[PDB]
Design a protein that fits this description.
This is part of a larger assembly, with two copies of chain A and one copy of chain C.
Chain A: H1 5-21, H2 33-37, H3 45-51, H4 77-80, H5 89-100, H6 110-133
Helix pairs in contact in A: 5-6
Chain C: no helix or strand
Classes of the chains: A mainly alpha, C little secondary structure.
Chain lengths: ~150, ~50, ~30
């Protein structure tokens, strides 16, 4: 379980190439065709592709000098087409999802899929950054019971 | 809610296009804000413009 | 990869209160 190397090589490399592909496929637009088409498939595919690249977005802030130097450097060029081509792909699909949900119907399947991505990754993002703010509040509960013991 | 409150605030056309027709298209975007609101809570319970 | 097992259905299934786009499997957003 401390041997996640090849998954990080084929999934950081496949996170590079396939989210370069998901910089258009999961960042689908033009125009709606049910909002991407299907932004619960598309924009939330860029959300989980950005949750697999939350290894390069949120667990880049967890892997802060863990064991090596190129885990977030040689994979950072694998996160240029990996993280901001998935997170902003979910934000082109999310700003174009809610903008697609700002389109007068909008629609019975376009805002269904699009808003379903924008509640799934929205509330999942809320409990996620609430788990990181509760990592500074569970660390403020925990490490500030250790560093700020006071002893 | 700021796409119906930026479409709504954008539908002011501050003249007011006769003298006070800002809330005509703006409140029309408020009717589209109720329809998009309840349609989106029919779509998404957790977030994305419930009400 | 960038699906990412499964951003098509199961990661849109973190809420998925939208029946039926369907575009997302099942089911809810909170169980507390």
């Amino acid at each position: 379980v401390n041997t996640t190397s090849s998954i990080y090589d084929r999934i950081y490399n496949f996170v590079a190439l396939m989210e370069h592909i998901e910089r258009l496929l999961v960042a689908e637009l033009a125009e709606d065709a049910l909002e991407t088409g299907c932004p619960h498939l598309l924009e939330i595919h860029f959300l989980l592709t950005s949750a697999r690249d939350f290894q390069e977005q949120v667990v880049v802030m967890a892997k802060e000098a863990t064991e090596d130097a190129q885990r977030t450097v040689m994979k950072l060029f694998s996160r240029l087409s990996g993280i901001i081509s998935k997170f902003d792909k979910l934000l082109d699909g999310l700003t174009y999802d809610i903008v697609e949900m700002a389109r007068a119907e909008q629609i019975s399947l376009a805002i269904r899929l699009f808003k379903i991505y924008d509640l799934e990754e929205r509330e999942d993002l809320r409990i996620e950054a609430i788990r990181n703010i509760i990592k500074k509040k569970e660390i403020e509960i925990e490490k500030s019971s250790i560093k700020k013991l006071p002893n | 809610n700021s796409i119906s409150e930026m479409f709504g605030e954008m539908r002011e056309k501050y003249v007011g296009d006769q003298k006070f027709d800002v809330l005509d298209n703006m409140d029309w975007i408020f009717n589209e804000l109720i329809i998009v609101k309840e349609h989106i809570a029919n779509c998404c319970p957790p977030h994305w413009n419930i009400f | 990869m960038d699906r990412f097992q499964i951003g098509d259905e199961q990661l849109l299934r973190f809420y998925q209160l939208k029946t039926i786009n369907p575009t997302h499997s099942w089911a809810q957003d909170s169980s507390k």
